[PDB]
């Protein structure tokens, strides 16, 4: 029924048929990306027009195509040919992962490099990594993958423990040619293993941990209807899933008594980049756009009950397409549950004798993905008081290198001879704002200190100032933790009872943004990451901060281009793009396996309600 | 037993007996402060010497006294008479609170002010607030409290909803005289009530929340021995309680294999100030040092099971002295339990076929206090991975005023006619560091951006830089969220297996520090709040960032005086003083009762261990 429901297996199959039939699907055609399209903001619209967008790659070498299918009608709406050298390459196919190792295994240059290091080629794993865009003119138009080797001493051995520094290969995965093999020098291959399940390393396991049981004897307080529509403690929303973004949230609204008030139209992590700060040519090109180039949604783990999600869990098993258009289900790929969150409000009043205490709760919508060495958990939380929060959790095994003799200013030692190059994990949350509807605007609020003098004789006064961002060319903002800078999104035509425009305030963590030199390739390709907040006029084709085809795209692809339009954002349909991330200088405690590190942001009601929206929560 | 055990009722009664016996506790005497002292450094003393320090007030007006007694030896170690005009008044006595409203009820100036606003004196509550130090010369040497009125329409009414602006009185609470009554003009007294338990206001209560049962079938995993010694998942510590500071953590150590490795010798919230930013003469003097002036510990609530502390809880009921030296127990005033904390580490390795997931947990030690309209929760957390964290939770009722007719730059509106002056809640965590022992050092670590060019041809490199703070003169530091500034505390003589000094990194939230003009009284009295981090050389008499006597005390004592000694802190017994707080511009959502707002900091191991300390964590 709902046009926001999750894609069905049936719908994926139908897309396959429709493609085949029109000749768009054949023998050397691989589906690099396939995902349902969101409704077009119309009124009654065309009853229900479920459209899917597909990126189709051609194994032979023929030009790829961007095609939009209509499943309800069974038609092909568009089918454009893509000039990848112009618009960038398509998302890396899962099936191209092995290819880089296989091709290198017969390359005499590779083999020579391995032989000089006394490495058995059958033990050398090669990580198929994105290439980005650097000084290699012969790569433009070609679908390249770079490779870095890791020695795996046996089937269950952790290869990350054994990086082979001083060597890197570039591979054309279409023409199947090893375009280049670079050996800058031999580096000792770290010998210590990092097998965290090897009782020789772990030591005897702890016997001290006693059970903690989180149970809901009467079940959860939230309802799931129409497959992915959630209703919980006045909150209302639809849980979507896209192969590229992962869990996406639609129509986040709050039922303020009678009115179901919209807050956020669509919330998603539209991009996730991991830039490395090691100036060694072996790794200086390394920058993974986990969302844009690899598609974090396809690599979502099947979360196990009790281990990954504890308590009363309600799962969603999204369905994606495989390389040939067949539907694949990610069983238990999404966790939905409500968890206790301490004290919500408390006051023991002397004068009244009333002692009041209420407990908080947060609805949780999460998924965990695995991209090579890292694993990331994406968590969305809705709180009783109207707060919306996102939190990313980074784990996995660190990406290793050799630790230079003489130390390093760009790499840290994890174990003898083992290094961990400096890097960052930068996210972009795309928030299609709908504060009490689509007529919104954003203001930058700074704390204002005042000078002692007339009107402030005791020099105790302090205020706040708000600047409305009116045109897109003024909506590219940076953080200022010092002055407590935040950004408020309000509806200038919807006022609370005190006659103030209803709003929501965005609280960032103010972590550092992209450190790379402004003139670097990564600065140009991931320009969104050089600023904390961007505001754009909504447009159905501006979906990602880095553009639609990130793989090997030259630069300035998304936000910088969109922002160039300089559209009116003062009281219009707008989108807030918040850049936030972690800057990592790995520590010895991050090895052999990294404990979770976290980052995020949140939005709190700012005059949205007429008084506290949690006065009706019972004692219990 | 352990010299860190909590003070028992017997010891307090004995301190009383010893004071009495010595002629220090006659009938006109009142205990303004009583607390056990920590054992001396090194411990060159044979056996235990439980010493208590006391601040003795004299109701007849005689000079007060600071006394240290040895309850073990039944002796008085020292007893000095205090010149309060010079060194500061003693903490406000709980009994002086009621004095303000009652003396004013018969003052004709007060009565004339109330009559002018048509208020029945029998319904006018007076909030007895600390006075601070301003231009009132007649106050120097006297114990003054200022009063602000709030109307209470009936016994169970919330007076905070009805502030009486334009009026303030000053009262000498010893001589029992109303020194001054200031009426700047009448302001409408807000009429709307703020009774959060009134069904008319709350509306019908939600029937939607289903139960969340958190149980521990086999009991908790921590052990409590000697009354306050906790051992949990390799952590070891003693939970102390001081009437001024509240919960204080002693001897925080981690069992790294065979060795019990010290991390933090003593951790406490040594001070907290709540400055107001309304330049109205009615409130411009308003600044509460809840810890130093009121003593947050004495006002600790008795926590209710399931309401305040859900799960398997182990309670501590600390004992304090009453104004007469008799022991008084705070029943269930401290909550101790462990809580699940999501995913600790996770990795699904392609190359190995090994899928690994471990869950996190944290030991929680907390207490909640109520000082007038505000209620604060103080939480300490210990994580499986070695992370230490503190979190303050601010709730209660907003301090109100009238909302000016033509708006306000320093006050916000909560209801019709109801205002909420701007303010901050700033804390000072005093961390007596012992990273693998007392020989510590602090380095300020900034992320370092590099220019593209020779050695960084692709402009992708980024580094880190560490500056050692060698003398106290250079140990007063500010935050820099932009360059990822943190501070590392290391033991320059204890190295990990990679031959690097073991350490812990302090991650601050980088919230705005004290906003008041530097030349303000509050800037001088709360100098510690104007900077994020201070490092001092340990001294047994440097306990609080503001000095032993904050009440009506000007600048001259505290951190700025300690620092001037300019001692060596490079590899010595040192103490870290971290300032962190909330800046509040109240919102309508904060009325009638405030939802919890939080702030804090944490310390993560930084090359302290030789590898991840959680490899032995089982399935879970
Ligand atoms: Ni990392
Ligand atoms: Ni506040």
Task: List C-alpha distances in Å: B119 to B179, B415, B540.
Answer: 22, 21, 52
Say if CB A71 and CB A52 are below 8 A apart.
yes
Which residue shows structure tokens 């003799």?
Answer: A405
Q: What are phi and psi of B199, to 5 degrees?
A: -50, -25
Say if CB B526 and CB B423 are below 8 A apart.
no
Say if CB B410 and CB B562 are below 8 A apart.
no
Strands B65-70 and A418-421: unpaired
Tell me the technique behind this structure.
Answer: X-ray
Which pairs with CB-CB distance under 8 Å and at least 24 residues apart come from A517-521?
A: A517/B449, A517/B450, A517/B451, A517/B452, A517/B456, A517/B459, A517/B460, A518/B459, A519/B452, A519/B459, A520/B452, A520/B458, A520/B459, A520/B460, A521/A132, A521/A133, A521/A134, A521/A555, A521/B458
Nearest to B604 by CA among B439, B418, B388: B388
Nearest to A189 by CA among A242, A132, A246, A118: A118
**Both tokens of residue A341?**
């969150």
Q: What is the CA radius of gyration of chain B?
A: 26
Say if CB B515 and CB B424 are below 8 A apart.
yes
Instruction: Provide the strand spans (E) within B257-300.
Output: 259-275, 287-289
A1-87 and A94-195: same fold?
yes
Taking the centre of ligand 2 as the mean of its atom positions, its distance from the CA of residue B419, in whole angstroms, is 13
Which residue shows structure tokens 């990092």?
Answer: A194
**Mutation site, A346, A497, A529, A583, interface B, largest B CB count within 10 A:** A346
**DSSP structure class, residue B457:** T
Which residue shows structure tokens 């910088």?
Answer: A560
Q: Which residues of B touch A585 (CB under 8 A)?
A: 464
Please, which residues bridge with residue A427 across strands? A272, A580
Q: Flag if A612 and B606 touch (Cβ within 8 Å).
A: no
For the four alpha carbons of A538, A539, A540 and A544, in that order, the dihedral sign comes to negative
Task: List C-alpha distances in Å: A346 to A614, A615, B336, B397, B445.
Answer: 12, 12, 19, 9, 38
B130/B256 Cα distance (integer angstroms):
47
**Mutation site, B156, B214, B343, interface A, largest A CB count within 10 A:** B343
Q: Is it true that domain B94-195 has CATH number 3.40.50.300?
A: no
Say if CB B444 and CB B466 are below 8 A apart.
yes
Taking the centre of ligand 1 as the mean of its atom positions, its distance from the CA of residue B387, in whole angstroms, is 17
Coil, helix or strand at residue A506: strand
Nearest to B538 by CA among B568, B581, B560, B512: B568
Say if CB B343 and CB B360 are below 8 A apart.
yes
The superfamily CATH assigns to domain B196-619 is Copper amine oxidase, catalytic domain (2.70.98.20)
- The verdict on B348 touching A (C-beta cutoff 8 Å) is yes
Taking the centre of ligand 2 as the mean of its atom positions, its distance from the CA of residue A457, in whole angstroms, is 23
For A258, how many CA atoms within 13 A lie in the half-sphere containing its CB? 0
Residue A441, H or E segment: strand A441-449
Task: List C-alpha distances in Å: B437 to A153, B441, B609.
Answer: 40, 11, 14
B5/B35 Cα distance (integer angstroms):
13
Q: What are phi and psi of A575, to 5 degrees?
A: -135, 130
Which residue shows structure tokens 């804390």?
Answer: B427
B409/B278 Cα distance (integer angstroms):
8
10 Å CB burial of residue B7 (0-12, 13-18, 19+) is buried
Contacts of A323 (CB under 8 A, 6+ apart): A30, A31, A93, A94, A95
> What does the domain layout of chain A look like in residue ranges?
1-87, 94-195, 196-619
For the four alpha carbons of B333, B337, B340 and B341, in that order, the dihedral sign comes to positive
A499/B144 Cα distance (integer angstroms):
41
Q: What is the 3-state secondary structure (H, E, C) of A409-421?
A: CCEEEEECCEEEE
B401/A369 Cα distance (integer angstroms):
51
Taking the centre of ligand 1 as the mean of its atom positions, its distance from the CA of residue A586, in whole angstroms, is 7
Resolution in Å equals 1.8
Q: Which residues of B touch A600 (CB under 8 A)?
A: none
10 Å CB burial of residue B13 (0-12, 13-18, 19+) is middle
A289/A558 Cα distance (integer angstroms):
14
Q: Which residues of B touch A494 (CB under 8 A)?
A: none
Nearest to B400 by CA among B385, B413, B384, B381: B413
Q: What number of other Cβ atoms are within 10 A of residue B8's Cβ?
A: 16
- The closest CB to that of B370, out of A339, A342, A348, belongs to A348
Would you say B292 is a known binding-site residue? yes
Alpha carbon of residue B374 to chain centroid: 13
**Both tokens of residue B31?**
């205990």
Residue A9, H or E segment: helix A9-21
**Both tokens of residue B74?**
């039944």
Say if CB A171 and CB A144 are below 8 A apart.
yes
B459/B461 Cα distance (integer angstroms):
6
**DSSP structure class, residue A33:** E
**Both tokens of residue B365?**
């030690």
- Is A153 annotated as catalytic? no
Strands A213-215 and B355-371: unpaired
User: Torsion angle, CA of B601/B607/B609/B614, rounded to 10 degrees?
Assistant: 60
Strands A574-584 and A423-433: antiparallel
Say if CB A479 and CB A486 are below 8 A apart.
no
Q: Flag if B152 and A351 touch (Cβ within 8 Å).
A: yes
Would you say A289 is a known binding-site residue? yes
Say if CB B141 and CB B67 are below 8 A apart.
no
Q: Flag if A386 and B589 touch (Cβ within 8 Å).
A: yes
Coil, helix or strand at residue B121: helix
B188/B76 Cα distance (integer angstroms):
56
| Nearest residue of chain B to residue A233 (CA atoms) | B208
**Catalytic residue from among B170, B276, B374, B538:** B374
**Catalytic residue from among A33, A170, A276, A374:** A374
| Nearest residue of chain A to residue B358 (CA atoms) | A307
Say if CB A489 and CB A572 are below 8 A apart.
no
Q: What is the 3-state secondary structure (H, E, C) of A443-483?
A: EEEEEEECCCECCECCCCCEEEEEEECCEHHHCEECCCHHH
DSSP string of A584-602? Answer: E---GGGSSSPPPEEEEEE
Q: Which fold has domain B1-87?
A: Nuclear Transport Factor 2; Chain: A, (3.10.450)
- Is B198 annotated as catalytic? no
**DSSP structure class, residue A609:** S
B230/B380 Cα distance (integer angstroms):
13
Q: What number of other Cβ atoms are within 10 A of residue A416's Cβ?
A: 12
Please, which residues bridge with residue A29 across strands? A58
Q: Flag if B463 and A422 touch (Cβ within 8 Å).
A: yes
Instruction: Provide the strand spans (E) within B37-162.
Output: 51-58, 65-70, 75-81, 124-130, 144-151
Say if CB B273 and CB B289 are below 8 A apart.
yes
Nearest to B171 by CA among B185, B160, B181: B181
Query: Could you tell me the strand order of the sheet in which A411-415 lies?
Result: A401-402, A418-421, A411-415
């Amino acid at each position: 029924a709902s046009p926001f429901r999750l894609a069905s297996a049936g719908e994926i199959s139908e897309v396959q048929g429709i493609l085949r039939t029109a000749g768009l699907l054949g023998p050397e055609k691989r589906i690099a990306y396939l995902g349902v399209l969101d409704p077009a903001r119309g009124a009654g619209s065309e009853a229900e027009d479920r459209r899917f967008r597909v990126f189709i790659h051609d194994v032979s070498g023929a030009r790829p195509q961007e095609v939009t299918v209509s499943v309800t009608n069974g038609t092909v709406i568009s089918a454009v040919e893509l000039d990848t050298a112009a618009t960038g390459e398509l998302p890396v196919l899962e099936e191209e992962f092995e290819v880089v190792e296989q091709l290198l295994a017969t390359d005499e240059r590779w083999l020579k490099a391995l032989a000089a290091r006394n490495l058995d080629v059958s033990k050398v794993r090669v990580a198929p990594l994105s290439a980005g865009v650097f000084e290699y003119a012969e790569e433009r138009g070609r679908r390249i993958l770079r490779g870095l080797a890791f020695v795996q001493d046996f089937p269950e051995d952790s290869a990350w423990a054994h990086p082979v520094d001083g060597l890197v290969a570039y591979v054309d995965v279409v023409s199947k040619e090893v375009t280049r093999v670079i050996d800058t020098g031999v580096f000792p291959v770290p010998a210590e293993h990092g097998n965290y399940t090897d009782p020789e390393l772990t030591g005897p396991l702890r016997t001290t941990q006693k059970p903690i049981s989180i149970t809901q004897p009467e079940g959860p307080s939230f309802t799931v209807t129409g497959g992915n529509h959630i209703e919980w403690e006045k909150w209302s929303l639809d849980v979507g899933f896209d192969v590229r973004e992962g869990v996406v949230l639609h129509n986040i609204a709050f039922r303020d008594g009678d009115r179901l008030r919209p807050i956020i139209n669509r919330a998603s992590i539209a991009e996730m980049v991991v830039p490395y700060g090691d100036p060694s040519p072996i790794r200086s090109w390394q920058n993974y756009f986990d969302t844009g180039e690899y598609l974090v949604g396809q690599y979502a783990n099947s979360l196990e009950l009790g281990c990954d999600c504890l308590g009363d869990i309600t799962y969603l098993s999204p369905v994606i397409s495989d390389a040939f258009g067949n539907p694949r289900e990610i069983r238990n790929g999404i966790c939905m549950h409500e968890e206790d969150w301490g004290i919500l409000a408390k006051h023991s009043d002397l004068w009244s004798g009333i002692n009041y205490t209420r407990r908080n709760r947060r609805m949780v919508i999460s998924f965990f993905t695995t991209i090579g060495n890292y694993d990331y958990g994406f968590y969305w939380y809705l709180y009783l008081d109207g707060t919306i929060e996102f939190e990313a959790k980074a784990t996995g095994v660190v990406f290793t290198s050799a630790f230079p003799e003489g130390g390093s200013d760009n790499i840290s030692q994890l174990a003898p001879g083992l290094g961990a190059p400096f890097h960052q994990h930068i996210f972009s949350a795309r928030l299609d704002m709908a504060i009490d509807g689509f007529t919104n605007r954003v203001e930058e609020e700074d704390v204002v200190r005042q000078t002692m003098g007339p009107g402030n004789e005791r020099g105790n006064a302090f205020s706040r100032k708000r600047t409305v961002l009116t045109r897109e060319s003024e909506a590219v903002r940076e953080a200022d933790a010092r002055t407590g800078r935040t950004w408020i999104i309000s509806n200038p035509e919807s006022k609370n009872r005190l006659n103030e425009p209803v709003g929501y305030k965005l609280h960032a963590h103010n972590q550092p943004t992209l450190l790379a030199d402004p003139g670097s390739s990564i600065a140009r390709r991931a320009a969104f990451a050089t600023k904390d907040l961007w505001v754009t006029r909504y447009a159905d084709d501006e979906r990602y901060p880095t553009g639609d085809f990130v793989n090997q795209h030259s630069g300035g692809a998304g936000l910088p281009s969109y922002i160039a339009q300089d559209r009116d954002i003062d009281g219009q349909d707008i989108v807030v793009w918040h850049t936030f991330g972690l800057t990592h200088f790995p520590r010895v405690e991050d090895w052999p396996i990294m404990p979770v590190d976290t980052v995020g942001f949140k939005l709190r009601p700012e005059g949205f309600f007429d008084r506290s929206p949690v006065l009706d929560v019972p004692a219990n």
